[PDB]
Write a protein that binds this ligand. Structure first.
Ligand SMILES: [Mg+2]
Ligand SMILES: [Mg+2]
Ligand SMILES: [Mg+2]
Ligand SMILES: [Mg+2]
Ligand SMILES: [Mg+2]
Ligand SMILES: [Mg+2]
Ligand SMILES: [Mg+2]
Ligand SMILES: [Mg+2]
Ligand SMILES: [Mg+2]
Ligand SMILES: [Mg+2]
Ligand SMILES: [Mg+2]
Ligand SMILES: [Mg+2]
Ligand SMILES: [Mg+2]
Ligand SMILES: [Mg+2]
Ligand SMILES: [Mg+2]
Ligand SMILES: [Mg+2]
Ligand SMILES: [Mg+2]
Ligand SMILES: [Mg+2]
Ligand SMILES: [Mg+2]
Ligand SMILES: [Mg+2]
Ligand SMILES: [Mg+2]
Ligand SMILES: [Mg+2]
Ligand SMILES: [Mg+2]
Ligand SMILES: [Mg+2]
Ligand SMILES: [Mg+2]
Ligand SMILES: [Mg+2]
Ligand SMILES: [Mg+2]
Lengths: 206, 46, 353
RNA sequence: CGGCACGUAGCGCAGCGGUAGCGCACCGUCAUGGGGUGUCGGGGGUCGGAGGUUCAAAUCCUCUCGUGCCGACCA
RNA sequence: CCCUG
RNA sequence: GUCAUCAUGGCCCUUACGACCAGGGCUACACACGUGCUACAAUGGCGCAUACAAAGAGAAGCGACCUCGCGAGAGCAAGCGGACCUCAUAAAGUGCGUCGUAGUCCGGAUUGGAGUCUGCAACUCGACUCCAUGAAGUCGGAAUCGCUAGUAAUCGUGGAUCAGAAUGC
RNA sequence: GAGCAUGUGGUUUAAUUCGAUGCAACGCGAAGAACCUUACCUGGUCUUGACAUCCACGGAAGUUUUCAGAGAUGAGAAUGUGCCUUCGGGAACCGUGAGACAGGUGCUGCAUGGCUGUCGUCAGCUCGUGUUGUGAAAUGUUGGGUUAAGUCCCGCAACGAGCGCAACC
C-alpha cells in the first residue's frame, strides 16, 4: 500500500504551515509562483549551507523569510553581507520589500531534512549506503530521538535491479495523529541513476 | 560459412516451413531477472 | 518550384543509391574490357563467344550510358533551373520540367528493368504466412503479420483475397494462403520469401517473460496449369499377342520406354483403349514426378542456404526493425507493422536478394 | 460394352408437380483468468449441366459428363 | 477436461 | 500503471525525430463491447394556480430593475470582492380540469426551415430557442450488477474544467 | 432488447497522435479537441535556433505605418533615442557573427526516483533475548473462552518490543 504524508496529514494538528500568509483569489496564483521561485533560489545557493526549513510570510506588501538552518555563521558570512545580498535579490524576486531572519537549529541530525541531505551526500560520494544508514541510526539514538526510520530506494550499490532498504527502531507511530513525526525526502543523482531517501523521526507523543 | 544440417532430411514441399518446424527457428525461453522464473540459486559472481 | 527542388534532390539521391547498388565503375571496367577484346578480331572468328560478348556488351554499355546521361541531365537541369529562378523564363522552365520528367522516367525504366527482371514477376502470386513451432505467440504474430501484409497490398493497390486461413484455438492464425492479384505482384513481393524474428514482451505468458517467435512468408507465382498433350502414334509401339485371337494389346511408349499390357477383354479395341488410358495415366504420373523432383532439387538448394532464410528481425522490446540481408534498420515499429515496408522492399529489390 | 443406382449448403444425409429440410460446421453474445465443453441467437444451397412439356419443374422426360454395383458367358 | 517451451 | 505531469542512468537525432504558420485530423464507419441518460406510459402526459430546501460561485465576474422579443437573448442600467446584491422562480408534491389504454395529447430520435449567444471564425466540428416532422420502442434471451436505513429508488440544485461547449465527475 | 451520449476494439483514410487494455483498462490520463489547444497528416518556411548563458560588433527599449504573402515571414517609411554615470563609463532591451551548446510529448516503467491501483481497512506482519532441533527452522504468534480486531483474561519456555488494531483528527 501507499502511505499518506506525515506532515500532509498533520498540518491541522501539530505541524505548523511553512507558509502562513493570507491572500485573496487575485494574488494567490502568482503568490505561489513567487513562493516557488524564492524557495528554489534559496535552496540553490543554500545547498552547501545546511538548510532545513524555509518559512515565508507576507504581512502587507512585504516578505518575511525565516530560514531554519544549522550553520548560521556560514549563512551570514563576515558581518552579514551574504544575508544582505540575499535580502536584496529576494526583494527583487518578490517585487516587495524583504527581510530575512536566520534560525539556528540545534541537533542537525535530529532534524529530518539534514539527515536526508547527509545521506544523499554519501550516496553521491559513493560511501556504502548501508554503513551510512547505520551511521544516521546511531546518530539519532545517541542524540536521543524517540524513534527513527530511514528508507533508501533505487539502484543501491550500482545494482541492475532496484530495491528498497529501510531501518527502524523505537516507536514510529504513523497512524497516531498527535505524534511529532518530522518526515522528509531527498534524491541522489548518482552516476547509475536516481536514489530516493525518506526519513521519519518520532520526537514525542504531543 | 558452413551448411546447416536441417532435421527434416529430404524436403519435398517447402524448406522454409521445414526449417520453421526444425529446432533452428524455435521459440526461445528467457530467464527472468525477477518475476516468475526469478529465483537464482547462485549469482553470476558468487 | 519548391517541389521541383525537392524532386531534383530526390532524383540525385536515388541516382546515387542506384550507382551504389549497381557498382557502376566495376561494370564500366568490364564494359571497357569487352570493348577491347571486341576490338581484337579473333572474337568474331569464334561465333558463340562473340554471341555472349554482344549480349554482355549491349547490357553494360546501356547501363553505363544511362547513368552517364542521368549525371549530365542532373547537372544541366540544375544549372538551367538556377537560370529559370532568376531570369524567370517560363518557356525554358517548362522545358526544364519536361526534360526532368523524361530523365526521371528513363531512370525509372532502368531501375524497372533491374527490379522486375524475373520471368514470373508480372504474374499474380500466392503468399503464405505460417507460424513457427512456438505456440500462441507465434500464432498472434502470424495473424498480425497477415494484417500488415493485407495493409501493404491495399496500399499498393493489389487486389487481395484470402484463399485459406487456418486459425489457432486461442488467438492468431496458424497459417494463411492469400491470392495477391495485380500486375507485377510477384515481382514486388518476391523478396519476402523467408523468416521473420519477433522479439516482444509476450502477453500470453503469465509472467510477462519476453518471447522470440518466428514466422515465414513464402510467395510463389500463379503458374499456368498447361494442358497435357496426347501421345503420338509413332511415339507409341503397338503390339498384339495371344491372351494368357491375339486380342492382347501391349502399348509401348518408345522415347521414354514404358509399356502397358491388356488382355482381359475379347475385343482388341477395348484392350487397346484401356492400354491407351494407362499410357495417359502413366505419362501424367511421370510428369508430376518430374515436377516434384525439380521442386525437391530447388528445396535442396534452399535448404542448403538454410539460415539465410531468416530475413527480417523486429525487436519490439528495443523497438528496432532490421533487414539482415540488406542490413538496414529503422525505429518506427508501429509504421513497419502498419505496412510501410516500401523502403525495405526497394532496398532488397535493388540488392537483388 | 449392356443394364441400374446417385449427383441436394463447406461436409454427411432426407425431400422426388406449387413448401427446399436435419445434423456437424461458420459467425455474434454469454460462462471462464483464458481455451474447450456448455447456453442464447442468426445466416448460408444455378437442388450436377443443358433443353423439352406443362400455368409452373429439384420432383416428369431426353441427352450429357462424373462415381458406385451387377454381368462382358458355351465354345 | 486443459494451461506454449 | 506512469520515461506523455515532473526528475533521471543509458541509447538515438542535431539544416532534423529540433523550431514557426495555415488547413485538415484527434468527432470517420459494414461491425462488436463497456459505462451512462431518456423512454416504452394513467403511481402518468398536458394545461392552470400555489407551498417546502441545502450547499456553492462571482471582478477580463455575478449581473438585479425597466423595455423589446413567443423564445433562446438583446439595449439601458443598480448592488456585490458578498450571512447584504446576483446566479436563483427549485422540482417531485398539493388543488382542479382533460386525456381513457391507443404506438396514443407516451416517446422525442431523425430531418427541413428560421434564429440567439460566445468566439477572429460554429462547414468538417458548439450549445441553446422557435416552427415543422414524429423513428425504434408496448419492460427486453442466455446471462449479469448495485444496495441493510435516511440506504436503495426517485426529484431537482450548485461547483471544478471553461470565451462557448455535460446524459461525465 | 430500443434510441441517444461517451469510451474502447476493429476497419478505413493523410492522420484517425500517444498511453491505460482481467477483477485492479474501457464517461480512463482528458476537471471539458472549432483555431492554439495536440504531441498526428498535408503544405509553406528557419537552423547557436521558438526557449538560456558566454564573447565580439552596431545600437535605446520602445511607438505609428506601407506593400506582398493564407500566415510564418521578406522588403520599405515616419516617431522616440533614454537609465543611472570616475564626459573611462557601463546594463533593461533589440539584431548580427560563430561555437560551447540549447532541444525532443524520440526509445527503454524489464535500468529508476517520485506518485498511484490491487489483494484490503483484510487482521495480520515481524524483531530482540532466551530455549528446543545437527539443520532448514520452532517458541513468542499456539490452548480455552471473548471481540469488528494478534482486542482482552487466564494457562503456557517463553519473557519483552515494534509496524499494524483501537484512541488522538
Ligand atoms: Mg491513500
Ligand atoms: Mg469354360
Ligand atoms: Mg491437450
Ligand atoms: Mg491499473
Ligand atoms: Mg505499458
Ligand atoms: Mg496548426
Ligand atoms: Mg477522443
Ligand atoms: Mg407526451
Ligand atoms: Mg462555479
Ligand atoms: Mg413498432
Ligand atoms: Mg400501452
Ligand atoms: Mg441528477
Ligand atoms: Mg462552462
Ligand atoms: Mg511512449
Ligand atoms: Mg486510441
Ligand atoms: Mg499498449
Ligand atoms: Mg467512472
Ligand atoms: Mg485545431
Ligand atoms: Mg513538414
Ligand atoms: Mg514495474
Ligand atoms: Mg543450539
Ligand atoms: Mg501468524
Ligand atoms: Mg511461527
Ligand atoms: Mg486463540
Ligand atoms: Mg496488538
Ligand atoms: Mg501466550
Ligand atoms: Mg486506526
Amino acid at each position: 500500500g501507499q502511505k499518506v504524508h506525515p506532515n500532509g496529514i498533520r498540518l491541522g494538528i501539530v505541524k505548523p504551515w511553512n507558509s502562513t500568509w493570507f491572500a485573496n483569489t487575485k494574488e494567490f496564483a502568482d503568490n505561489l509562483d513567487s513562493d516557488f521561485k524564492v524557495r528554489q533560489y534559496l535552496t540553490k545557493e543554500l545547498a552547501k549551507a545546511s538548510v532545513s526549513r524555509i518559512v515565508i510570510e507576507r504581512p502587507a506588501k512585504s516578505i518575511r523569510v525565516t530560514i531554519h538552518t544549522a550553520r548560521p555563521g556560514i549563512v551570514i558570512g563576515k558581518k552579514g553581507e551574504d544575508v544582505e545580498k540575499l535580502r536584496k535579490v529576494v526583494a527583487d524576486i518578490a517585487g516587495v520589500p524583504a527581510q530575512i531572519n536566520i534560525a539556528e537549529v540545534r541537533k542537525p541530525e535530529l532534524d529530518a531534512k539534514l539527515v536526508a541531505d547527509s545521506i544523499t551526500s554519501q550516496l553521491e560520494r559513493r560511501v556504502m549506503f548501508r554503513r551510512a544508514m547505520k551511521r544516521a541510526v546511531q546518530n539519532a539514538m545517541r542524540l536521543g530521538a524517540k524513534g527513527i526510520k530511514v528508507e533508501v530506494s533505487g539502484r543501491l550499490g550500482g545494482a541492475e535491479i532496484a530495491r528498497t532498504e529501510w531501518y527502524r527502531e523505537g516507536r514510529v507511530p504513523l497512524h497516531t495523529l498527535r505524534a511529532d513525526i518530522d518526515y522528509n525526502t531527498s534524491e541522489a543523482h548518482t552516476t547509475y541513476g536516481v536514489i530516493g531517501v525518506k526519513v521519519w523521526i518520532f520526537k514525542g507523543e504531543i | 560459412m558452413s551448411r546447416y544440417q536441417h532435421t527434416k532430411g529430404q524436403i519435398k514441399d517447402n524448406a522454409i516451413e521445414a526449417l520453421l518446424h526444425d529446432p533452428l527457428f524455435r521459440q526461445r525461453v528467457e530467464k527472468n531477472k525477477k518475476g516468475k522464473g526469478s529465483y537464482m540459486r547462485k549469482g553470476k559472481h558468487g | 518550384i519548391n517541389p521541383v527542388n525537392n524532386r531534383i534532390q530526390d532524383l540525385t539521391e536515388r541516382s546515387d543509391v542506384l550507382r551504389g547498388y549497381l557498382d557502376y565503375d566495376a561494370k564500366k571496367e568490364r564494359l571497357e574490357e569487352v570493348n577491347a577484346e571486341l576490338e581484337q578480331p579473333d572474337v568474331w572468328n569464334e561465333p558463340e563467344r562473340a554471341q555472349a560478348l554482344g549480349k554482355e556488351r549491349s547490357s553494360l554499355e546501356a547501363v553505363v550510358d544511362t547513368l552517364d546521361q542521368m549525371k549530365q541531365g542532373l547537372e544541366d537541369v540544375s544549372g538551367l533551373l538556377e537560370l529559370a529562378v532568376e531570369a524567370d523564363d517560363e518557356e525554358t522552365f517548362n522545358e526544364a520540367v519536361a526534360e526532368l520528367d523524361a530523365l526521371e522516367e528513363k531512370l525509372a525504366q532502368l531501375e524497372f528493368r533491374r527490379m522486375f527482371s524475373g520471368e514470373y514477376d508480372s504474374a499474380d502470386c500466392y503468399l503464405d504466412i505460417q507460424a513457427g513451432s512456438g505456440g500462441t505467440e507465434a500464432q498472434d504474430w502470424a495473424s498480425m503479420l497477415e494484417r500488415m501484409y493485407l495493409r501493404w497490398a491495399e496500399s499498393r493497390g493489389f487486389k487481395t483475397e484470402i484463399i485459406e486461413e487456418s486459425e489457432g484455438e486461442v488467438a492468431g492464425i496458424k497459417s494463411v494462403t492469400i491470392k495477391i492479384s495485380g500486375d507485377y505482384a510477384y515481382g514486388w513481393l518476391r523478396t519476402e520469401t523467408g523468416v521473420h524474428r519477433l522479439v516482444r514482451k509476450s502477453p500470453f505468458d503469465s509472467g510477462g517473460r519476453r518471447h522470440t517467435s518466428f514466422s515465414s512468408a513464402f510467395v510463389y507465382p500463379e503458374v499456368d496449369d498447361d494442358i497435357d498433350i496426347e501421345i503420338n502414334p509413332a511415339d507409341l509401339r503397338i503390339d498384339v499377342y495371344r491372351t494368357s485371337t491375339e486380342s492382347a494389346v501391349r502399348i509401348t511408349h518408345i522415347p521414354t520406354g514404358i509399356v502397358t499390357q491388356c488382355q482381359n477383354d475379347r475385343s482388341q479395341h477395348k484392350n487397346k483403349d484401356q492400354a491407351m488410358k494407362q499410357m495417359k495415366a502413366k505419362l501424367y504420373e511421370l510428369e508430376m514426378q518430374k515436377k516434384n523432383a525439380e521442386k525437391q532439387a530447388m528445396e535442396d538448394n534452399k535448404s542448403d542456404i538454410g539460415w539465410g532464410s531468416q530475413i527480417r528481425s523486429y525487436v519490439l522490446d528495443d523497438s528496432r526493425i532490421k533487414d539482415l540481408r540488406t542490413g538496414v534498420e529503422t525505429r518506427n515499429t508501429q509504421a513497419v507493422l502498419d505496412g510501410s515496408l516500401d523502403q525495405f522492399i526497394e532496398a532488397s529489390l535493388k540488392a537483388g536478394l
